């Protein structure tokens with residue numbers, strides 16, 4: 001939820017994002033930096049090393065889907081809740097992931113964007129993204145409260 | 146929220162609650178156990194020691210005030226996001242209290258209710274009250290998004 | 291490390307618990323399961339019904355480790371090393387849950403020790419359970 | 432708590448930062464104020480607009496505190512004492528804010544040291560900043 005010019009600033013920058021690369025880096029980094037998140041991906045294979053996680057095919061493939069889900073949300077920046085209602089049921093009632101983790105993944109994505117884009121990821125541009133991240137996190141969490 | 150059986154159990158219990166006392170004890174404990182919270186009440190004068198806080202006149206008075214909001218939310222258990230709308234904007238936009246603190250006060254209240262009722266504060270009755278506390282905290286926080 | 295005053299309060303408090311520690315640890319678990327259902331996710335192999343002998347048994351073990359942590363207040367990292375590795379490395383318990391169990395413990399203590407659960411004791415116990423939590427999630431943070 | 436591998440990654444990364452420290456301390460603050468406006472309430476006496484000489488100066492001080500911690504990784508409690516007293520006793524900073532500054536710092540570092548900012552480094556830096564946060568948070572647990 002943001003003004004229409006911010007919305008345009010964000011959607012414009014999202015165009016230059018390689019979802020195959022960024023997605024897998026973000027999910028991988030989520031698993032490395034916050035290791036308790038691995039119990040949810042025990043079927044993805046070997047997650048014993050940072051190198052194993054970063055090079056894991058299921059991690060790279062799954063990271064892409066998450067970002068597609070993120071690209072989907074970009075296009076529905078008002079009713080973020082209705083868009084992620086199917087995922088909210090998946091994460092909350094089925095997997096039982098704590099809401100705090102959606103925030104960590106969103107924060108890890110901001111770090112990944114900054115690493116890949118350098119100075120193009122200005123402070124004011126990050127601020128807008130920090131708003132879509134909390135939005136996605138909150139919508140993803142509404143089936144819990 | 147809550148099922149109708151829960152709502153009835155919660156409502157009946159509340160009938161025995163001395164809100165004037167419990168409220169003062171809850172806010173005082175919040176200020177003793179989680180020290181940074183005092184930043185918002187420097188105007189209450191002396192809070193330097195556990196006893197100065199617990200015996201502070203404005204603390205007991207403001208506590209009574211916080212609890213009355215609770216009793217009021219207990220009569221609008223289906224419209225919590227509406228009852229606390231004004232209170233939410235106050236705390237958020239004019240006072241700048243991080244929402245995490247709403248959860249901390251909520252939990253302190255449960256511990257205070259437990260110390261004042263002992264045996265009667267059953268594991269099931271507490272589960273019911275945790276639901277209300279979560280609901281109230283979420284209603285107070287909706288102005289942060 | 292807690293301050294000497296804090297250590298004093300924890301030890302005084304746990305003394306009053308005495309031969310009830312296992313009853314209180316099991317109750318803290320029942321209250322955590324009821325109040326925060328997500329935690330049940332970690333015990334799919336348990337019978338979680340009210341009165342379960344599994345829950346009672348485990349509550350005794352939880353209380354046992356808290357007692358040992360109290361008798362070793364000046365070296366929490368050392369006393370709970372095996373427990374640290376079980377919770378952080380093999381079980382992968384999300385840190386959020388430790389706050390829920392700590393809270394259920396404080397509610398249990400508060401209901402059984404009304405006069406002893408003063409504001410200062412409350413604050414001392416909270417710091418203690420936080421230190422324990424911090425130790426148990428060390429293989430990671 | 433920091434392992435030897437962590438202490439190694441933190442020292443390696445901060446060595447790369449070098450003389451850019453002050454600058455990154457300023458950028459991290461600017462990002463924090465913009466991303467999480469609530470943190471501005473702690474600085475009513477600062478001009479928080481872009482390029483303020485008060486933000487630069489202050490970022491330089493934050494960067495200096497961190498360099499000191501990096502050189503004294505084994506004794507963070509001794510090295511950051513004065514600052515712990517200040518942030519916890521005097522200022523009363525809500526501990527949530529430390530998470531917000533740490534995230535801003537990580538973001539700043541990532542954008543200036545992409546090759547060096549690997550997953551393992553990100554993880555160690557994250558642990559270092561949390562350990563630092565826990566110390567400034569020391570006067571209350």
Ligand code: HEM
Nearest residue numbers: 037040041065066069070095097101102105106136137140
């Ligand atoms: C806030 C950002 C998140 C988004 C947008 C997201 C997106 C997705 C998507 C698109 C799926 C695929 C559903 C399907 O098509 O079947 C999914 C599955 C999953 N997500 Fe998330 N997710 C997020 C956060 C998290 C977090 C923080 C965790 C846990 C620590 C998590 C755990 C899972 C798991 C276990 C699966 C199922 C994987 C499998 O099929 O084995 N997600 N998520």
Ligand code: HEM
Nearest residue numbers: 182185186210211214215240242246247248250251282285
């Ligand atoms: C979760 C339960 C909470 C409820 C239901 C609640 C309710 C209230 C109410 C009704 C007032 C207005 C009282 C009046 O008209 O005088 C108030 C004022 C205030 N509250 Fe809260 N509050 C909550 C949490 C918090 C927290 C956690 C903090 C932050 C540490 C906080 C800080 C304040 C401050 C500083 C004021 C203004 C004091 C004044 O006007 O003198 N509140 N709160």
Ligand code: HEM
Nearest residue numbers: 329332333351352355356373377381383387388391392422
């Ligand atoms: C105050 C912190 C806690 C203490 C003192 C503690 C202590 C213990 C002890 C003594 C055991 C038995 C270990 C053994 O047999 O060697 C255990 C196991 C375990 N704990 Fe904890 N624990 C704590 C927190 C948690 C949390 C927050 C969760 C998550 C809800 C949890 C989940 C488990 C599980 C799933 C097991 C294994 C059960 C089994 O298969 O037997 N614990 N804990």
Ligand code: HEM
Nearest residue numbers: 470473474492493496497514518522524528529532563564
């Ligand atoms: C890793 C985290 C942090 C470090 C290393 C740090 C470091 C410092 C240093 C070196 C000073 C100057 C002390 C002096 O010379 O008087 C300071 C001051 C201050 N800090 Fe922090 N700080 C941290 C986190 C925070 C956070 C999260 C806040 C609140 C959003 C905060 C708010 C303040 C305030 C209000 C001052 C006083 C400013 C003035 O009066 O000029 N600090 N900090």
